């Protein structure tokens, strides 16, 4: 049995454009493990993030978390693109700063 991933994109802090914080795309509950995750800003992939080592949950379904330290603004939209093997088209999600 293969399990489509669960995707939650969010920030560490409530988003008010003023100072610096850190954002994270959290993907959990997927199987198998062939998971390709990218952080996108305004449609273009962010170059170098931190790809954490793979972690296993009690339900055989793995979970990964990608994150960056940056300063958010009010004129840019951010998103997370994931292309597991269970879905035929790469899914993209928008971070809702609200």
């Amino acid at each position: 049995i293969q399990r489509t991933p669960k995707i939650q994109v969010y920030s560490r802090h409530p988003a008010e454009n003023g100072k610096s914080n850190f954002l994270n795309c959290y993907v959990s509950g997927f199987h198998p493990s062939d998971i390709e995750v990218d952080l996108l800003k305004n449609g273009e992939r962010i170059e170098k993030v931190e790809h954490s080592d793979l972690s296993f949950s009690k339900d055989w379904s793995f979970y990964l978390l990608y994150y960056t330290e940056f300063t958010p603004t009010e004129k840019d939209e951010y998103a997370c693109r994931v292309n597991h093997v269970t879905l035929s088209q790469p899914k993209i999600v928008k971070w809702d700063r609200d």
Binding site: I1, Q2, R3, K6, Q8, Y10, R12, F22, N24, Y26, S28, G29, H31, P32, S33, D34, D53, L54, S55, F56, K58, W60, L65, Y67, D98
Partner: protein, 265 residues
């Protein structure tokens, strides 16, 4: 309300000789002693800062454990493909989990020792702790054979003895941990979605441990709407619950005799 769990995973890399073998240990949902085969000069390496206080015997003895459990799975994957005629070029996974859950009072709560293949359960140790339960025809024979061998008594020995003493060693030795004590600053936000599709969102952020209960009432049942617990980058966790005019957000957390009471402030 505490637990120690060992997660072991073997992945079939086609066209590449060495199958990927990985192990990760956990106290509750806190990671430690992560182990990998694709690391420079491979051995057991400690992730947590508090585990680094263990002796070298842990690393040499335990790394021998990893070697045994690794060559074992190496021999076992060819057994999987020898029982199942499947295209060798395909990538398959076999996972092995073994952990013990103990309560804060010291009494043993429950113990788990289970094995799955390619996302489908294969064999597991029953709640009786003396009988196995197999999920497919292939694991039937493994279950009967393991029954005659009586693996349940040795596994019960490990889960009731060594693993509990270790769990007390990790929770007792490193006492500075678990002091974030889940102190969430929960407040509710509100917008107006068009056509009145709006929802009130109670937010509990920055807490730790992860076990927590969000509620809403005057909404007590079939109402609200929530997400799965998500870890924040700070090492904390966060959560929110939305409801579709006196509405209250009550939260069960770790704190002084006080749940939570919140309306539109």
């Amino acid at each position: 309300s505490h637990s120690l769990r060992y997660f072991v995973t073997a992945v079939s890399r086609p066209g590449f000789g060495e199958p990927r073998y990985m192990e990760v240990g956990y106290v509750d949902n806190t990671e430690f002693v992560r182990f990998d085969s694709d690391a420079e000069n491979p051995r057991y390496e400690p992730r947590a800062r508090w585990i680094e206080q263990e002796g070298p015997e842990y690393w040499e003895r335990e790394t021998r454990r990893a070697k045994g459990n690794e060559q074992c799975f190496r021999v076992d994957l060819r057994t999987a493909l020898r029982y199942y005629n499947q295209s060798a070029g395909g990538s398959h996974t076999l996972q092995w989990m073994a952990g013990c859950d103990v309560e804060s009072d010291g009494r043993l709560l429950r113990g788990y020792w289970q094995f799955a293949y390619d996302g489908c359960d294969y064999i597991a140790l029953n709640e009786d702790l003396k009988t196995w339960t197999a999920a497919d025809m292939a694991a039937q024979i493994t279950r009967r054979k393991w029954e005659q061998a009586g693996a349940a008594e040795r596994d019960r020995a490990y889960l009731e003895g060594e693993c509990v003493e270790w769990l007390r060693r990790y929770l007792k030795n490193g006492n500075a941990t678990l002091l974030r004590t889940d102190p969430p600053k929960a407040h509710v936000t509100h917008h107006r979605r068009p056509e009145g599709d709006v929802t009130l969102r109670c937010w509990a952020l920055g807490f730790y441990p992860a076990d927590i209960t969000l509620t809403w009432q005057l909404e007590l049942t079939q109402e609200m709407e929530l997400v799965e617990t998500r870890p924040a980058g700070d090492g904390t966790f966060q959560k929110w619950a939305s409801v579709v005019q006196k509405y209250t957000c009550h939260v069960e957390h770790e704190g002084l005799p006080e749940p939570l009471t919140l309306r539109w402030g």
